[PDB]
Amino acid sequence: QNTSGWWNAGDVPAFDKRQLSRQLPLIRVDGNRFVDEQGNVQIFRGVSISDPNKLAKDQHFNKKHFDVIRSWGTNVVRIPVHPSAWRERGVKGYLELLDQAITWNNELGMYTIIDWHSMGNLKSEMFQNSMYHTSKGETFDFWRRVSERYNGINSVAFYEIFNEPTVFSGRLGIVSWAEWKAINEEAITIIQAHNPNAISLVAGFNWAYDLREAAANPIERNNVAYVSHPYPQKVGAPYQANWERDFGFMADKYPVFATEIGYQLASDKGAHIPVIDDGSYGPRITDYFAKKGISWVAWVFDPDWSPQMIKSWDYEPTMQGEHFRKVMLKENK
């Protein structure tokens, strides 16, 4: 942290919007669903890239990477900004990556989710791992900078406050839904004061799985949607009834953006709980979300991070890539 940390970074040059030729339709929350300016329901079906910091190191942070994503039918790209990578590149250096990613998405007709990709208990400052480490100050500062910088770019529609809240059964300490609600409310006040049209994606606990505590005491802000990460082994059979109880019912009251789903075989690279399945979860979760009108983002247009959507940098789809591509090609554009 010279002039690269959130608390000491210099003036940051504004984003030059003369790189953009495209203004996608403005999305807003209307009760239960996302709608455009005509009140037509929008459903988003897309992919997470890996952290731009990793893409740039791997030499695949280029237009071709984003053209392939678009060619899969993708109408939304999720950008998981790891606070670790934000510190490694510094504020200025990281915003150059994020500007370029957003430019490529925008020109290809794809909406963006900016995801502050942490994991654990922000209030108590206990994270799954050092790569997720952040603070309330750094988190608020990030949302202050990106909400202002991308204000008026309709394609940058969604602001995902904090990827995966969890206390890991007390290993990461204690936080009530009430305390988490207050932190989300402050983050959304920051976002809306810089960016009147920003939609905010709010998560509950058990790694952004549960929405029952959210439903009982919802975020008192406009333009809010609720996140779940219903990975294959978060619950067992019967799947649809369990999903409905835990998060799906929330789609009746607010839009639900399942910002991570994915799956691979127990034999596939980096296979771990809760991402292991025989392949039946793919159609099951996709069909469930079609019945419910739920937006979703498959985890990870990357050949290294698990579960993989692509087998290598030749961009051949994996089992999960094949399935999500088929659904995005049929049901999106």
Side-chain angles (χ1 to χ4, degrees), residues 120-121 126 165-176 205-207:
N121 179 357
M126 313 182 69
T166 186
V167 287
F168 193 3
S169 296
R171 292 176 112 92
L172 307 188
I174 303 174
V175 59
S176 71
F205 283 86
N206 193 17
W207 289 267

Side-chain angles (χ1 to χ4, degrees), residues 6-10 12-17 20-27:
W6 65 274
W7 54 273
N8 53 39
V12 177
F15 180 47
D16 194 16
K17 291 192 189 147
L20 306 178
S21 73
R22 229 108 139 56
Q23 177 80 116
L24 304 189
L26 174 56
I27 309 303

Side-chain angles (χ1 to χ4, degrees), residues 36-290 292-312:
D36 62 16
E37 296 92 320
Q38 290 89 52
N40 296 146
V41 188
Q42 299 299 329
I43 302 182
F44 302 88
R45 306 181 192 83
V47 310
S48 294
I49 54 164
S50 53
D51 194 319
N53 185 54
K54 173 162 188 298
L55 272 180
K57 282 187 193 165
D58 288 359
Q59 246 98 243
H60 284 277
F61 196 62
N62 51 57
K63 195 191 197 308
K64 169 178 141 81
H65 186 67
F66 290 81
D67 291 328
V68 177
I69 291 164
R70 186 44 190 174
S71 78
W72 288 24
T74 309
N75 66 5
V76 62
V77 170
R78 181 172 180 254
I79 305 178
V81 179
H82 296 57
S84 164
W86 175 254
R87 274 178 279 105
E88 182 189 352
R89 296 266 170 177
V91 170
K92 179 171 85 152
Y94 202 95
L95 287 180
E96 289 168 6
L97 297 185
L98 192 58
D99 285 359
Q100 185 64 88
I102 276 156
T103 297
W104 285 330
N105 289 338
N106 192 81
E107 292 309 288
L108 287 165
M110 297 188 294
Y111 289 84
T112 294
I113 305 167
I114 302 170
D115 151 28
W116 188 231
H117 202 81
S118 190
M119 184 180 304
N121 179 357
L122 179 59
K123 181 227 193 220
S124 299
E125 298 174 309
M126 313 182 69
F127 301 98
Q128 188 87 50
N129 163 90
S130 293
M131 100 177 86
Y132 302 115
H133 187 89
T134 185
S135 63
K136 224 161 93 151
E138 187 184 50
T139 298
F140 290 165
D141 179 68
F142 175 75
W143 291 121
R144 169 181 181 189
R145 284 178 201 279
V146 307
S147 65
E148 178 192 50
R149 170 173 274 259
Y150 308 118
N151 185 41
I153 309 165
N154 299 339
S155 77
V156 186
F158 310 109
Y159 289 70
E160 185 173 358
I161 307 305
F162 186 105
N163 163 57
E164 278 190 0
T166 186
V167 287
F168 193 3
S169 296
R171 292 176 112 92
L172 307 188
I174 303 174
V175 59
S176 71
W177 169 265
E179 288 164 318
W180 190 237
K181 164 181 142 71
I183 292 166
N184 277 271
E185 283 172 353
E186 182 158 17
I188 297 162
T189 294
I190 295 159
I191 289 165
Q192 288 185 345
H194 298 270
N195 192 321
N197 291 331
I199 298 162
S200 302
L201 311 187
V202 177
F205 283 86
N206 193 17
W207 289 267
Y209 175 60
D210 187 68
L211 295 178
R212 285 181 289 175
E213 297 196 290
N217 191 10
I219 301 299
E220 298 178 47
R221 293 288 190 279
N222 301 320
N223 253 350
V224 171
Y226 289 88
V227 170
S228 190
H229 290 183
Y231 279 119
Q233 307 175 289
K234 274 271 131 184
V235 290
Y239 286 111
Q240 292 93 344
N242 283 341
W243 295 339
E244 190 69 26
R245 171 205 55 224
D246 287 336
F247 71 93
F249 75 94
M250 183 74 117
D252 301 339
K253 199 90 191 158
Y254 302 99
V256 168
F257 216 150
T259 57
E260 284 182 28
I261 53 177
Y263 65 105
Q264 61 180 353
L265 302 147
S267 48
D268 283 348
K269 187 167 52 145
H272 60 285
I273 298 177
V275 117
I276 297 165
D277 193 74
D278 61 0
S280 56
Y281 162 96
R284 207 179 333 271
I285 193 70
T286 250
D287 284 350
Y288 178 65
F289 286 171
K292 272 306 204 181
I294 287 181
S295 300
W296 55 258
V297 191
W299 178 257
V300 85
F301 212 84
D302 190 273
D304 307 322
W305 293 355
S306 160
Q308 302 81 14
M309 281 186 79
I310 53 174
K311 291 187 172 162
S312 79

